[PDB]
Amino acid sequence: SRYEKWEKIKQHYQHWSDSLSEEGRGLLKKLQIPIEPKKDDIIHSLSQEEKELLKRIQIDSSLSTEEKEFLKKLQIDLSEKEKEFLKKLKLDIQPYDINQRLQDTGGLIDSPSINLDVRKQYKRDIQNIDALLHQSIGSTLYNKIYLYENMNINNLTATLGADLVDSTDNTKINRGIFNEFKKNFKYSISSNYMIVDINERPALDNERLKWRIQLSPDTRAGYLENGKLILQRNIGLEIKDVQIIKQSEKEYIRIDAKVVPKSKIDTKIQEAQLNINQEWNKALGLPKYTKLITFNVHNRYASNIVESAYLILNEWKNNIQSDLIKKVTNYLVDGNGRFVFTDITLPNIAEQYTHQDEIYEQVHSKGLYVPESRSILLHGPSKGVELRNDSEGFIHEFGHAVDDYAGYLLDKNQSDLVTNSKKFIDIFKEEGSNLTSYGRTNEAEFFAEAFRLMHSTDHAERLKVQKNAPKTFQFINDQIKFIINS
Numbered sequence: 001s002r003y004e005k006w007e008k009i010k011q012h013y014q015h016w017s018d019s020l021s022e023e024g025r026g027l028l029k030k031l032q033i034p035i036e037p038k039k040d041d042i043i044h045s046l047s048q049e050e051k052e053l054l055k056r057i058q059i060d061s062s063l064s065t066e067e068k069e070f071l072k073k074l075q076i077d078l079s080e081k082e083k084e085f086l087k088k089l090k091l092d093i094q095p096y097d098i099n100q101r102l103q104d105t106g107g108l109i110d111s112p113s114i115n116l117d118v119r120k121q122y123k124r125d126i127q128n129i130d131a132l133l134h135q136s137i138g139s140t141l142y143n144k145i146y147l148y149e150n151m152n153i154n155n156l157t158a159t160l161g162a163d164l165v166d167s168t169d170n171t172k173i174n175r176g177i178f179n180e181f182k183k184n185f186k187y188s189i190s191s192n193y194m195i196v197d198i199n200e201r202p203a204l205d206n207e208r209l210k211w212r213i214q215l216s217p218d219t220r221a222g223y224l225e226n227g228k229l230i231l232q233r234n235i236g237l238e239i240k241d242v243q244i245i246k247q248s249e250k251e252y253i254r255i256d257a258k259v260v261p262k263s264k265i266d267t268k269i270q271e272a273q274l275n276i277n278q279e280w281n282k283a284l285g286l287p288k289y290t291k292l293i294t295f296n297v298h299n300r301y302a303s304n305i306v307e308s309a310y311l312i313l314n315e316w317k318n319n320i321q322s323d324l325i326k327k328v329t330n331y332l333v334d335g336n337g338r339f340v341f342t343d344i345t346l347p348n349i350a351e352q353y354t355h356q357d358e359i360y361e362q363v364h365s366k367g368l369y370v371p372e373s374r375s376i377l378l379h380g381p382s383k384g385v386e387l388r389n390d391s392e393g394f395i396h397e398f399g400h401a402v403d404d405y406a407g408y409l410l411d412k413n414q415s416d417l418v419t420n421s422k423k424f425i426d427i428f429k430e431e432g433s434n435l436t437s438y439g440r441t442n443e444a445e446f447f448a449e450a451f452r453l454m455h456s457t458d459h460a461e462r463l464k465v466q467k468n469a470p471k472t473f474q475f476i477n478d479q480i481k482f483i484i485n486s
């Protein structure tokens with residue numbers, strides 16, 4: 001029975017439940033219900049000058065959907081002063097969310113991406129919760145019960161989430177896309193505390209993923225009221241089957257998964273990382289043991305992050321001249337650079353935060369190039385600006401590395417980016433608004449966008465650059481030939 005199964009699991013944890021202190025209970029509640037910031041408290045902290053800016057800021061021009069929405073709620077009550085202001089206010093509007101801190105950091109909670117005092121608070125709570133979850137599901141119950149988790153598609157990757165629901169009929173799933181999603185999804189990792197239902201729960205808004213999970217005998221867990229279980233963090237899941245199913249006259253994605261030791265999955269990730277480095281060290285003429293490609297993977301869409309990297313690098317190789325690729329990559333390797341493919345947020349990537357002490361200067365986005373570490377960083381799960389796919393965004397980031405190397409060759413001592421040279425600056429104030437909306441941001445991003453579009457698979461997109469921005473077009477080709485001939 002649905003009910004009998006519930007009472008049985010509750011009984012198994014009954015002693016554990018009664019044994020909880022009020023402090024333990026409050027901790028579990030805080031984990032389930034994050035402490036939101038009070039808009040009252042925020043606005044009261046702002047000066048008079050400041051208060052006014054928020055109302056005048058066009059907020060949707062940047063920040064994440066949640067943050068821009070919350071700020072709008074404050075509004076009723078970008079210039080260089082406007083970005084710097086938001087970059088600081090962003091630090092004050094974050095909810096205290098234990099599961100989110102664990103997900104964002106992939107469990108590396110010492111990452112200096114948040115205020116030291118709050119960082120330690122998260123750490124204490126996490127360590128105490130780990131201590132609460134000490135009783136395993138056991139050898140009797142584990143193969144007699146299923147546990148369930150409804151999930152938003154956008155949580156794994158917001159790229160597929162955009163068009164995975166059939167645009168024609170929203171009650172059905174896009175078959176082709178589903179087949180790709182299914183073929184690259186073989187294993188999953190939970191770095192935070194999964195909160196699962198004992199009995200399957202009817203889907204709510206944007207819950208088209210319905211996980212069915214079998215635990216292992218030694219999977220630690222704790223009963224939560226109203227028929228739920230909290231599972232220990234740091235577990236692995238093997239994807240046993242992905243199917244399209246029909247529930248109450250509508251289609252969903254069944255995900256069957258079995259809990260396995262996380263270390264077993266990390267083994268597969270490190271093997272894959274070893275493999276992809278072997279293949280590309282050869283193809284690029286690098287020393288066999290060069291560490292170039294990093295899989296920084298800790299979350300629920302783990303395997304696709306790995307598989308996506310292979311395709312991204314392949315597109316990168318198919319659309320950019322071999323000599324340019326070899327020249328620039330060797331330069332990055334000379335600076336111990338990396339191609340980092342990850343599902344944790346970029347402020348928690350060492351190749352960024354090592355060179356950025358100020359948290360308000362740390363950036364989370366779909367992609368980044370960090371000159372100080374000669375590294376390209378690509379975040380799988382998130383959505384890009386305006387961008388067709390991750391392959392193109394990678395080419396964009398590689399554009400930044402191209403900018404980097406070109407300016408270096410110009411002046412090997414006190415190196416700079418060519419987009420800081422007087423020639424491109426003037427080119428930019430002329431042709432800076434002739435390409436993508438994001439190309440307008442600055443010289444660097446304009447260069448990178450132009451570089452990207454000049455290497456698009458679509459013919460039309462590369463002539464556009466040659467058409468709408470011929471000076472930029474020629475300038476880039478000049479840098480390319482200059483680099484190759486170096």
Ligand SMILES: Cc1cc(S(=O)(=O)N(CC(C)C)[C@@H](C(=O)NO)C(C)C)ccc1F
Nearest residue numbers: 365366367368369384385387390393394396
């Ligand atoms: C799709 C995708 C999206 C981005 S992005 O984060 O939106 N982006 C701009 C983007 C047009 C290329 C970032 C960027 O410039 N990185 O260096 C900005 C937001 C700092 C990065 C990689 C990608 F593959």
Ligand SMILES: [Zn+2]
Nearest residue numbers: 396400445448
């Ligand atoms: Zn960029």
